[PDB]
Amino acid sequence: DHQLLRYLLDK
Amino acid sequence: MELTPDQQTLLHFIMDSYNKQRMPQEITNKILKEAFSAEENFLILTEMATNHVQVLVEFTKKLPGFQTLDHEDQIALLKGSAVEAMFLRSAEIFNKKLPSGHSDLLEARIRNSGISDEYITPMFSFYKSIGELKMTQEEYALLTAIVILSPDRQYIKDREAVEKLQEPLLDVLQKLCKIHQPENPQHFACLLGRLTELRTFNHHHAEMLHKFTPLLCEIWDV
Ligand SMILES: CC(C)NC(=O)n1c(-c2ccccc2)cc2c1CN(S(=O)(=O)c1cccs1)CC2
């Protein structure tokens, strides 16, 4: 779950 | 009455990251050019709401101390505030960012997206209510930060850590009201009024819910 949200927050 | 060097620094950080965001030209062209249908208008709102979540994550990352929070609480804060942040930014765009004639075309598309009037009516009422307050950019930026850094969202492991981040923002916002509106000692209470109004939109939104963007599906838990 929420893989893209995790990607945006850590990028 | 004046902001301490600490409150000034904290305000300057919020302001800088808030001004960084803007509406894409690629979206603006769709508002002007795309066909006027319930499917096409719903597709435009989907594009706008997705762009907003991306802009909301960039703003949130830069919030003083947000990165010092537990990685899981950072996600629960983003998920809990996404809907409220969308309605507050929507109010800003409606009262500011759009040209007189283009806003009419956008309103025409928001009212013809296949969404029920029992939801569209309190939405425009909310924008109108925000418009009445004649909020400065600092107020929009501080309200958005207070919304994101809410210690009372579901699934937060360390709420006290969040309280420590939000309380200084409420202190800055209250002091700005005393400085710029000393003749209106109810100005701060009016802004808190919009915070409670914003929270009803969480209930309206869940009841409001064509499959959406992955960024939307995840941040809304649908
Ligand atoms: C640009 C952001 C801040 N606002 C936005 O996209 N709006 C606006 C709006 C209001 C004023 C100016 C510009 C835009 C009205 C509505 C939405 C999104 N949806 S949604 O998220 O429920 C939705 C997503 C997909 C299908 S419906 C609610 C209806």
Side-chain angles (χ1 to χ4, degrees), chain A, chain B residues 1-99 101-217 219-222:
Chain A
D1 64 341
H2 47 256
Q3 303 165 83
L4 178 55
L5 193 53
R6 281 194 194 275
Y7 170 81
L8 292 173
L9 186 68
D10 300 312
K11 68 163 177 156
Chain B
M1 338 285 161
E2 59 179 54
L3 295 178
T4 64
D6 201 57
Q7 290 171 325
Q8 263 181 100
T9 300
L10 175 73
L11 183 61
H12 204 283
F13 271 73
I14 307 282
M15 285 317 279
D16 191 65
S17 75
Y18 199 76
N19 273 74
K20 289 285 169 74
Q21 75 197 242
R22 64 181 193 91
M23 190 172 76
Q25 177 82 302
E26 299 84 47
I27 257 153
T28 306
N29 275 62
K30 283 176 78 75
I31 276 142
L32 175 91
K33 286 146 83 186
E34 290 293 349
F36 199 83
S37 174
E39 262 169 78
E40 287 264 45
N41 295 342
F42 194 88
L43 247 90
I44 291 154
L45 289 174
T46 292
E47 262 236 53
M48 294 178 88
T50 302
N51 172 256
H52 168 72
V53 175
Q54 285 170 263
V55 140
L56 168 73
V57 174
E58 291 307 288
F59 173 74
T60 303
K61 279 162 83 167
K62 298 161 185 71
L63 286 174
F66 182 82
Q67 281 165 307
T68 76
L69 297 166
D70 186 84
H71 197 253
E72 276 167 26
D73 295 348
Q74 282 183 51
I75 303 292
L77 285 178
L78 276 165
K79 284 176 90 120
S81 66
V83 168
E84 279 169 36
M86 183 284 289
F87 282 104
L88 183 49
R89 178 58 191 186
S90 289
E92 196 190 29
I93 294 152
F94 174 90
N95 300 297
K96 203 185 172 73
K97 277 87 186 70
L98 275 169
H102 270 207
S103 68
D104 278 30
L105 234 75
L106 185 48
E107 180 157 7
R109 292 200 199 256
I110 298 164
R111 298 176 177 274
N112 280 256
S113 55
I115 297 167
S116 181
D117 291 296
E118 65 159 320
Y119 305 109
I120 294 295
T121 308
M123 202 182 295
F124 281 97
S125 176
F126 175 71
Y127 308 156
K128 285 282 180 187
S129 142
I130 281 270
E132 281 172 53
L133 294 192
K134 307 247 270 169
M135 283 172 62
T136 58
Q137 202 64 19
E138 292 80 10
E139 285 161 9
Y140 274 120
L142 287 163
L143 273 194
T144 309
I146 292 154
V147 158
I148 299 151
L149 303 170
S150 288
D152 65 328
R153 307 286 187 194
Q154 282 179 67
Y155 329 115
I156 290 148
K157 271 99 193 165
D158 189 5
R159 329 202 152 268
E160 208 245 77
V162 188
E163 283 185 333
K164 264 170 181 154
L165 298 183
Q166 193 201 47
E167 221 266 323
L169 301 169
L170 290 162
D171 288 330
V172 173
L173 183 59
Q174 195 215 25
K175 201 178 264 181
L176 281 176
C177 295
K178 283 179 193 170
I179 290 158
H180 303 302
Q181 305 274 339
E183 81 301 323
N184 186 12
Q186 270 294 108
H187 194 261
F188 187 62
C190 288
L191 288 163
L192 300 178
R194 308 313 93 109
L195 223 61
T196 57
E197 283 188 56
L198 265 187
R199 283 203 99 108
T200 73
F201 283 102
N202 274 137
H203 123 276
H204 286 286
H205 196 85
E207 291 177 327
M208 252 194 272
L209 316 168
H210 25 52
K211 284 172 266 175
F212 304 85
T213 286
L215 197 47
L216 296 185
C217 299
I219 213 151
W220 295 339
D221 243 304
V222 71

mmCIF file of all heavy atoms in Angstrom, chain B residues 26-53:
data_model
loop_
_atom_site.group_PDB
_atom_site.id
_atom_site.type_symbol
_atom_site.label_atom_id
_atom_site.label_comp_id
_atom_site.label_asym_id
_atom_site.label_seq_id
_atom_site.Cartn_x
_atom_site.Cartn_y
_atom_site.Cartn_z
ATOM 1 N N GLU B 26 -0.100 23.127 -18.514
ATOM 2 C CA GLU B 26 -0.632 21.918 -19.142
ATOM 3 C C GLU B 26 -2.043 21.593 -18.628
ATOM 4 O O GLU B 26 -2.841 21.025 -19.371
ATOM 5 C CB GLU B 26 0.330 20.745 -18.911
ATOM 6 C CG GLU B 26 1.714 20.966 -19.518
ATOM 7 C CD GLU B 26 2.725 21.751 -18.696
ATOM 8 O OE1 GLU B 26 2.879 21.458 -17.488
ATOM 9 O OE2 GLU B 26 3.396 22.635 -19.275
ATOM 10 N N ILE B 27 -2.348 21.979 -17.368
ATOM 11 C CA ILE B 27 -3.667 21.825 -16.753
ATOM 12 C C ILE B 27 -4.559 22.982 -17.224
ATOM 13 O O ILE B 27 -5.668 22.728 -17.688
ATOM 14 C CB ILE B 27 -3.580 21.652 -15.201
ATOM 15 C CG1 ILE B 27 -3.789 20.176 -14.811
ATOM 16 C CG2 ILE B 27 -4.564 22.559 -14.431
ATOM 17 C CD1 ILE B 27 -3.113 19.745 -13.503
ATOM 18 N N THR B 28 -4.043 24.238 -17.153
ATOM 19 C CA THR B 28 -4.707 25.488 -17.568
ATOM 20 C C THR B 28 -5.261 25.369 -18.991
ATOM 21 O O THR B 28 -6.398 25.780 -19.239
ATOM 22 C CB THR B 28 -3.733 26.678 -17.420
ATOM 23 O OG1 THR B 28 -3.211 26.702 -16.090
ATOM 24 C CG2 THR B 28 -4.376 28.029 -17.755
ATOM 25 N N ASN B 29 -4.470 24.774 -19.908
ATOM 26 C CA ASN B 29 -4.869 24.531 -21.291
ATOM 27 C C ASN B 29 -6.072 23.590 -21.379
ATOM 28 O O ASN B 29 -6.940 23.840 -22.204
ATOM 29 C CB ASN B 29 -3.697 24.019 -22.136
ATOM 30 C CG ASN B 29 -2.823 25.122 -22.697
ATOM 31 O OD1 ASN B 29 -2.198 25.903 -21.963
ATOM 32 N ND2 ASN B 29 -2.745 25.198 -24.021
ATOM 33 N N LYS B 30 -6.152 22.548 -20.509
ATOM 34 C CA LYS B 30 -7.286 21.609 -20.488
ATOM 35 C C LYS B 30 -8.588 22.315 -20.080
ATOM 36 O O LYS B 30 -9.616 22.093 -20.716
ATOM 37 C CB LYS B 30 -7.003 20.386 -19.604
ATOM 38 C CG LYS B 30 -6.082 19.352 -20.264
ATOM 39 C CD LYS B 30 -5.727 18.179 -19.342
ATOM 40 C CE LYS B 30 -6.822 17.138 -19.188
ATOM 41 N NZ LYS B 30 -6.948 16.259 -20.382
ATOM 42 N N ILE B 31 -8.524 23.208 -19.060
ATOM 43 C CA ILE B 31 -9.641 24.045 -18.597
ATOM 44 C C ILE B 31 -10.178 24.855 -19.783
ATOM 45 O O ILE B 31 -11.392 24.944 -19.960
ATOM 46 C CB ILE B 31 -9.193 24.938 -17.386
ATOM 47 C CG1 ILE B 31 -9.294 24.154 -16.065
ATOM 48 C CG2 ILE B 31 -9.977 26.267 -17.292
ATOM 49 C CD1 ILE B 31 -8.181 24.426 -15.063
ATOM 50 N N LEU B 32 -9.273 25.395 -20.625
ATOM 51 C CA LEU B 32 -9.653 26.175 -21.799
ATOM 52 C C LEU B 32 -10.086 25.336 -23.001
ATOM 53 O O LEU B 32 -11.110 25.643 -23.585
ATOM 54 C CB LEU B 32 -8.525 27.163 -22.208
ATOM 55 C CG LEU B 32 -8.752 27.973 -23.514
ATOM 56 C CD1 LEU B 32 -9.444 29.297 -23.243
ATOM 57 C CD2 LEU B 32 -7.458 28.194 -24.272
ATOM 58 N N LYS B 33 -9.308 24.307 -23.379
ATOM 59 C CA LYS B 33 -9.457 23.518 -24.610
ATOM 60 C C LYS B 33 -10.319 22.248 -24.578
ATOM 61 O O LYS B 33 -11.061 22.051 -25.540
ATOM 62 C CB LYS B 33 -8.074 23.131 -25.161
ATOM 63 C CG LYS B 33 -7.320 24.292 -25.822
ATOM 64 C CD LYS B 33 -5.805 24.213 -25.613
ATOM 65 C CE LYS B 33 -5.087 23.312 -26.598
ATOM 66 N NZ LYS B 33 -3.649 23.155 -26.251
ATOM 67 N N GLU B 34 -10.182 21.359 -23.567
ATOM 68 C CA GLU B 34 -10.902 20.065 -23.535
ATOM 69 C C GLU B 34 -12.429 20.166 -23.695
ATOM 70 O O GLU B 34 -13.009 21.175 -23.316
ATOM 71 C CB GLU B 34 -10.553 19.236 -22.293
ATOM 72 C CG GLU B 34 -9.130 18.683 -22.298
ATOM 73 C CD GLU B 34 -8.730 17.623 -23.318
ATOM 74 O OE1 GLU B 34 -9.612 17.062 -24.010
ATOM 75 O OE2 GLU B 34 -7.514 17.332 -23.398
ATOM 76 N N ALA B 35 -13.073 19.127 -24.276
ATOM 77 C CA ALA B 35 -14.527 19.109 -24.513
ATOM 78 C C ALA B 35 -15.348 19.272 -23.233
ATOM 79 O O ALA B 35 -14.891 18.880 -22.160
ATOM 80 C CB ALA B 35 -14.932 17.833 -25.241
ATOM 81 N N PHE B 36 -16.533 19.879 -23.339
ATOM 82 C CA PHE B 36 -17.417 20.091 -22.198
ATOM 83 C C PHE B 36 -18.430 18.937 -22.076
ATOM 84 O O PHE B 36 -19.549 19.007 -22.595
ATOM 85 C CB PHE B 36 -18.107 21.455 -22.293
ATOM 86 C CG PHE B 36 -18.687 21.973 -20.999
ATOM 87 C CD1 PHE B 36 -17.887 22.631 -20.075
ATOM 88 C CD2 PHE B 36 -20.049 21.882 -20.745
ATOM 89 C CE1 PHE B 36 -18.434 23.151 -18.900
ATOM 90 C CE2 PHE B 36 -20.595 22.405 -19.571
ATOM 91 C CZ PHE B 36 -19.787 23.038 -18.659
ATOM 92 N N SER B 37 -17.999 17.868 -21.399
ATOM 93 C CA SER B 37 -18.762 16.647 -21.138
ATOM 94 C C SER B 37 -18.559 16.261 -19.669
ATOM 95 O O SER B 37 -17.581 16.683 -19.063
ATOM 96 C CB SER B 37 -18.263 15.523 -22.043
ATOM 97 O OG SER B 37 -18.871 14.276 -21.745
ATOM 98 N N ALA B 38 -19.461 15.446 -19.103
ATOM 99 C CA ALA B 38 -19.358 14.982 -17.716
ATOM 100 C C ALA B 38 -18.097 14.129 -17.504
ATOM 101 O O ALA B 38 -17.476 14.225 -16.445
ATOM 102 C CB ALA B 38 -20.606 14.197 -17.331
ATOM 103 N N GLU B 39 -17.711 13.326 -18.524
ATOM 104 C CA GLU B 39 -16.530 12.453 -18.518
ATOM 105 C C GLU B 39 -15.254 13.282 -18.587
ATOM 106 O O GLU B 39 -14.349 13.070 -17.782
ATOM 107 C CB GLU B 39 -16.576 11.455 -19.691
ATOM 108 C CG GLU B 39 -17.098 10.077 -19.324
ATOM 109 C CD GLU B 39 -17.392 9.186 -20.517
ATOM 110 O OE1 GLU B 39 -16.432 8.622 -21.092
ATOM 111 O OE2 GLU B 39 -18.585 9.048 -20.874
ATOM 112 N N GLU B 40 -15.190 14.233 -19.533
ATOM 113 C CA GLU B 40 -14.041 15.116 -19.732
ATOM 114 C C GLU B 40 -13.820 16.059 -18.552
ATOM 115 O O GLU B 40 -12.673 16.283 -18.178
ATOM 116 C CB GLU B 40 -14.170 15.898 -21.047
ATOM 117 C CG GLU B 40 -13.941 15.056 -22.293
ATOM 118 C CD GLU B 40 -12.540 15.090 -22.875
ATOM 119 O OE1 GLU B 40 -11.561 14.982 -22.099
ATOM 120 O OE2 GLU B 40 -12.423 15.192 -24.119
ATOM 121 N N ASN B 41 -14.902 16.599 -17.961
ATOM 122 C CA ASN B 41 -14.812 17.491 -16.806
ATOM 123 C C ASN B 41 -14.365 16.727 -15.573
ATOM 124 O O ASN B 41 -13.551 17.253 -14.812
ATOM 125 C CB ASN B 41 -16.115 18.250 -16.562
ATOM 126 C CG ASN B 41 -16.487 19.210 -17.681
ATOM 127 O OD1 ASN B 41 -15.657 19.603 -18.509
ATOM 128 N ND2 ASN B 41 -17.767 19.557 -17.784
ATOM 129 N N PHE B 42 -14.840 15.469 -15.401
ATOM 130 C CA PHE B 42 -14.434 14.616 -14.275
ATOM 131 C C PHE B 42 -12.960 14.258 -14.409
ATOM 132 O O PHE B 42 -12.263 14.174 -13.396
ATOM 133 C CB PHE B 42 -15.281 13.332 -14.183
ATOM 134 C CG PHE B 42 -15.143 12.600 -12.866
ATOM 135 C CD1 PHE B 42 -15.962 12.916 -11.786
ATOM 136 C CD2 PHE B 42 -14.186 11.604 -12.700
ATOM 137 C CE1 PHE B 42 -15.827 12.251 -10.565
ATOM 138 C CE2 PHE B 42 -14.043 10.949 -11.478
ATOM 139 C CZ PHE B 42 -14.876 11.266 -10.423
ATOM 140 N N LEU B 43 -12.496 14.041 -15.654
ATOM 141 C CA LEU B 43 -11.102 13.737 -15.962
ATOM 142 C C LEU B 43 -10.170 14.913 -15.631
ATOM 143 O O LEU B 43 -9.049 14.685 -15.183
ATOM 144 C CB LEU B 43 -10.941 13.319 -17.428
ATOM 145 C CG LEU B 43 -10.533 11.857 -17.660
ATOM 146 C CD1 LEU B 43 -11.752 10.955 -17.797
ATOM 147 C CD2 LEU B 43 -9.654 11.722 -18.902
ATOM 148 N N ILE B 44 -10.637 16.156 -15.828
ATOM 149 C CA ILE B 44 -9.872 17.369 -15.514
ATOM 150 C C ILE B 44 -9.694 17.503 -13.995
ATOM 151 O O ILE B 44 -8.564 17.690 -13.544
ATOM 152 C CB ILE B 44 -10.467 18.634 -16.210
ATOM 153 C CG1 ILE B 44 -10.244 18.548 -17.737
ATOM 154 C CG2 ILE B 44 -9.866 19.944 -15.657
ATOM 155 C CD1 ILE B 44 -11.245 19.325 -18.604
ATOM 156 N N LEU B 45 -10.781 17.336 -13.206
ATOM 157 C CA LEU B 45 -10.697 17.390 -11.744
ATOM 158 C C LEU B 45 -9.731 16.321 -11.206
ATOM 159 O O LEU B 45 -8.974 16.595 -10.278
ATOM 160 C CB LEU B 45 -12.075 17.253 -11.080
ATOM 161 C CG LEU B 45 -13.050 18.440 -11.202
ATOM 162 C CD1 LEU B 45 -14.417 18.085 -10.625
ATOM 163 C CD2 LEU B 45 -12.505 19.683 -10.515
ATOM 164 N N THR B 46 -9.720 15.128 -11.834
ATOM 165 C CA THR B 46 -8.813 14.023 -11.508
ATOM 166 C C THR B 46 -7.356 14.465 -11.709
ATOM 167 O O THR B 46 -6.532 14.246 -10.823
ATOM 168 C CB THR B 46 -9.245 12.756 -12.284
ATOM 169 O OG1 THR B 46 -10.502 12.338 -11.754
ATOM 170 C CG2 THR B 46 -8.252 11.600 -12.156
ATOM 171 N N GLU B 47 -7.066 15.142 -12.839
ATOM 172 C CA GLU B 47 -5.745 15.669 -13.175
ATOM 173 C C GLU B 47 -5.334 16.736 -12.162
ATOM 174 O O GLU B 47 -4.246 16.651 -11.601
ATOM 175 C CB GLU B 47 -5.744 16.254 -14.589
ATOM 176 C CG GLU B 47 -5.201 15.313 -15.645
ATOM 177 C CD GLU B 47 -4.040 15.864 -16.452
ATOM 178 O OE1 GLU B 47 -3.042 16.323 -15.847
ATOM 179 O OE2 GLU B 47 -4.111 15.792 -17.698
ATOM 180 N N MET B 48 -6.222 17.703 -11.884
ATOM 181 C CA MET B 48 -5.965 18.774 -10.914
ATOM 182 C C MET B 48 -5.712 18.247 -9.497
ATOM 183 O O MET B 48 -4.753 18.679 -8.857
ATOM 184 C CB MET B 48 -7.095 19.806 -10.916
ATOM 185 C CG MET B 48 -7.203 20.579 -12.215
ATOM 186 S SD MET B 48 -8.587 21.731 -12.156
ATOM 187 C CE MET B 48 -7.803 23.156 -11.430
ATOM 188 N N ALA B 49 -6.540 17.295 -9.027
ATOM 189 C CA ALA B 49 -6.411 16.722 -7.674
ATOM 190 C C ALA B 49 -5.116 15.917 -7.520
ATOM 191 O O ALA B 49 -4.508 15.955 -6.454
ATOM 192 C CB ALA B 49 -7.627 15.868 -7.333
ATOM 193 N N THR B 50 -4.676 15.222 -8.596
ATOM 194 C CA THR B 50 -3.429 14.457 -8.603
ATOM 195 C C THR B 50 -2.245 15.414 -8.480
ATOM 196 O O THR B 50 -1.385 15.210 -7.616
ATOM 197 C CB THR B 50 -3.344 13.571 -9.841
ATOM 198 O OG1 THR B 50 -4.487 12.713 -9.848
ATOM 199 C CG2 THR B 50 -2.047 12.751 -9.894
ATOM 200 N N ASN B 51 -2.220 16.476 -9.314
ATOM 201 C CA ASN B 51 -1.160 17.479 -9.287
ATOM 202 C C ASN B 51 -1.057 18.088 -7.884
ATOM 203 O O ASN B 51 0.050 18.252 -7.374
ATOM 204 C CB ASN B 51 -1.388 18.575 -10.344
ATOM 205 C CG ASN B 51 -0.416 19.728 -10.198
ATOM 206 O OD1 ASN B 51 -0.767 20.814 -9.709
ATOM 207 N ND2 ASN B 51 0.862 19.463 -10.463
ATOM 208 N N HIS B 52 -2.208 18.386 -7.261
ATOM 209 C CA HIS B 52 -2.259 18.929 -5.906
ATOM 210 C C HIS B 52 -1.560 18.021 -4.864
ATOM 211 O O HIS B 52 -0.839 18.540 -4.015
ATOM 212 C CB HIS B 52 -3.692 19.285 -5.478
ATOM 213 C CG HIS B 52 -3.786 19.555 -4.007
ATOM 214 N ND1 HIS B 52 -3.263 20.712 -3.450
ATOM 215 C CD2 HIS B 52 -4.222 18.750 -3.013
ATOM 216 C CE1 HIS B 52 -3.444 20.594 -2.149
ATOM 217 N NE2 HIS B 52 -4.003 19.424 -1.837
ATOM 218 N N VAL B 53 -1.770 16.696 -4.923
ATOM 219 C CA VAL B 53 -1.133 15.758 -3.979
ATOM 220 C C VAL B 53 0.409 15.794 -4.097
ATOM 221 O O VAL B 53 1.121 15.752 -3.088
ATOM 222 C CB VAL B 53 -1.708 14.320 -4.077
ATOM 223 C CG1 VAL B 53 -0.946 13.367 -3.174
ATOM 224 C CG2 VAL B 53 -3.186 14.302 -3.716
#
